[PDB]
Amino acid sequence: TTTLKKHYVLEKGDSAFENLEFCTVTSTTDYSGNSALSGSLCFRNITKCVINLQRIFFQTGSIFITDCTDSIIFLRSPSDKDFQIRLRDLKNCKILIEKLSPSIDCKQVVIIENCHKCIFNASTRDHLIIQDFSNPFNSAFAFEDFDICNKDTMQLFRAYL
């Protein structure tokens, strides 16, 4: 069973969102700023959703997205140089990953595994390091321009879903 047409609001303490279809997930505007030292977020079985997290409520840790199709993924990762974003079994997703960092040559590593036809926004090219760990020692991803719709979650919903 999946849940349809629900807006999920990320709050501190939440760590998992699963079995979503034509849903949205966004960061809460309330209790903002307060963060835990370490955390982890996991998304699993996501279809035709908009994930738009402009605020993460842990300083260090990871975001995992697994089994995700035809979705929009906007993430604003913490400044933590070692922050992890691991993407597995993504198909036909548009991705905007930015890092909230005052660092000069700020880079966000993105680990991908078994992804296909993923589009990373071209604006993020110089800031991401994509490492394909599918079969560790081409059409997995590409960098293209697309309208980010002012990062308005429902506009993205209407534009791409």
Author numbering: 101 to 237, 245 to 268
The publication says:
TBCA and TBCB are replaced by TBCD and TBCE, respectively. TBCE-α-tubulin and TBCD-β-tubulin to form a supercomplex. GTPase complex that we term TBC-DEG.
activating protein (GAP) function of TBCC. homology domain (light green), and a β-sheet domain (dark green). interaction with TBCC (as determined by mass spectrometry). from each other, without dissociation from the TBC-DEG/TBCC platform. αβ-tubulin configuration and activate Arl2 GTP hydrolysis.
